[PDB]
Design a protein around this nucleic acid. Structure first.
Ligand SMILES: CC[n+]1c(-c2ccccc2)c2cc(N)ccc2c2ccc(N)cc21
Ligand SMILES: CC[n+]1c(-c2ccccc2)c2cc(N)ccc2c2ccc(N)cc21
Lengths: 276, 276
DNA sequence: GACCCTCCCCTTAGGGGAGGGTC
DNA sequence: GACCCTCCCCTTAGGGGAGGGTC
């Protein structure tokens, strides 16, 4: 009342660090009422402690410091408004994050499936859920000459909506009795969608579509140039032996086992085709 | 395939800035496959573009860069785990924020009431909702000698739970036919609670309680030392004239109209008492 | 002894230059 | 011409010292 608080006093009283008070002083957000012309010691009054309330609350909600300066100068009505601003900014952060919880949750579901592989290199028939995907005409591309860059445009579309880029790389081609790799060309290349958020101004050359719900003859394995083709062969054979009727392209997905530059790269390949 | 991408090429392809690639290089998160010993130009392969997926997704969810380095080295199972970590960290952020939406919403409701004052300086009788509060025995304090520092301990308790410090400052005293200020002493001083989150290890000397739901004889005004007492007088008179029966202490709240150091300080005073 | 002062260095993830040199 | 290089300065909100000087 009729004396001042030293810095340490204020700091214990308002639960704000000395360093912070000192800094709040440098920026002129909150200044000691008095500074001893000799010692440079900061001294504060009791009445001024109340200006800290605003500072602490705004800090708590994450208002930048230089905004608080603008905030101090408000009568209630205008400060009421100010708060609705903070509210809608918090709702955005909420929507953003809840979207994010759902996405990761899904990314996870997809990882689990690809570690619960029944076995590698043998053919399974399984019942699959729909997978939404964006795809593009693969303009004469195939296994021997497709690049990561081929996917770039698709990826830009996905990332803009989903946020989460990392995924598998897909392509499709016709089920034929192929007798070598060079014999084969992809129909479409594609990548899966994870969200249900409208894609911004998608352009004609992309197609939003799905790998439909159905029974599927599958084969999955860890990639090796040798095994690519010979595994497809198993799949062809499997189908011929059981006289199954195929009802879609061959769908091939490729997904990195890891993303380390320090280790040898390695991929999971999965090839599936729908049967009746 | 049999050549490299320059930096600008990669940047267009992965939608990552040159500055970022350059930086990701400085930290060894992602390094060009080749650097021209003469020009220092960075050159990248197609195969390596895939390491960016992880980088971009993790960046999207806000993993610090130095964590991504640890993240790259994971097989799927361990990376699955990693993701559940990210999930629970997102839930915390969600709980935090949703708490925050509710708090501000309330802070707002309270501001509206104190701008919908029916009029200042005249007495109203109104029906009030409960207000939860923490209070402490005011050890002989009163109007003439209470400080902001008096509230400090209460405030520490509130802030630890609510996050939001800024509020009104309350006190209570006995309804007597006072004939001067020095005649009066506060019973308890208090501050309102905003959350319903358990207060951490509150200590006996605090009381969690409320200003109960009821009818109340009120008077509110903008503070002036003169008007403090004379307004109380109106309230006493009001009650005597209508022979009302009082059923609680006088509750006094004080709230800053603004938090500017640059303007003259100014307070709203509200004095209310419960009647049957 | 305890408290306070200034000044200097640190962390994040780059963006915006300037002034080279290179495709 | 357009692209790329290095190096230097910038923003946030302080925390952790060191080496004074002061309660
Ligand atoms: C789908 C083709 N394909 C092959 C491949 C398949 C058969 C023969 C030769 C290469 C490949 C081979 C190596 N080593 C490394 C990466 C990839 C790859 C990477 C992405 C992608 N979308 C397709 C990819
Ligand atoms: C409730 C008392 N009171 C009075 C006051 C009331 C009557 C006579 C003299 C001072 C006050 C007067 C001025 N100028 C500035 C701040 C305050 C204040 C601030 C906080 C608080 N909790 C109580 C406060």
């Amino acid at each position: 009342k009729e004396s001042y608080y030293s810095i340490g006093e204020v700091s214990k009283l308002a639960n704000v660090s000395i360093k912070a008070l000192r800094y709040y002083d440098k920026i002129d957000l909150f200044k000691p009422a008095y500074v001893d012309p000799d010692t440079s010691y900061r001294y504060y009054t009791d009445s001024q402690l109340i200006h800290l309330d605003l500072i602490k609350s705004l800090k708590y909600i994450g208002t930048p410091l230089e905004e608080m300066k603008k905030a101090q100068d408000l009568e209630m009505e205008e400060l009421f408004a100010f708060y609705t601003e903070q509210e809608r900014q918090i709702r955005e952060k909420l929507d953003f994050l809840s979207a994010l919880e759902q996405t990761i949750s899904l990314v996870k579901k997809r990882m689990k499936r690809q570690m619960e592989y029944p076995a590698l290199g043998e053919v399974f028939v399984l019942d699959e859920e729909e997978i939404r995907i964006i795809q593009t005409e693969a303009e004469g591309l195939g296994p021997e000459n497709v690049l990561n860059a081929s996917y770039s445009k698709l990826k830009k579309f996905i990332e803009s909506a989903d946020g989460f880029t990392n995924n598998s790389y897909g392509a499709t081609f016709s089920f034929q009795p192929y007798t070598s790799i060079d014999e084969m060309t992809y129909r479409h290349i594609f990548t899966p969608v994870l969200t249900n958020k409208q894609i911004s101004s998608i352009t004609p050359d992309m197609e939003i579509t799905t790998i439909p719900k159905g029974r599927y003859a599958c084969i999955a394995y860890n990639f090796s140039p040798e095994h690519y083709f010979l595994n497809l062969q198993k799949l062809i054979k499997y189908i011929a032996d059981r006289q199954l009727t195929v009802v879609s392209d061959v769908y091939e997905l490729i997904i990195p086992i890891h993303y380390s530059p320090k280790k040898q790269e390695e991929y999971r390949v999965e090839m599936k085709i729908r049967i009746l």
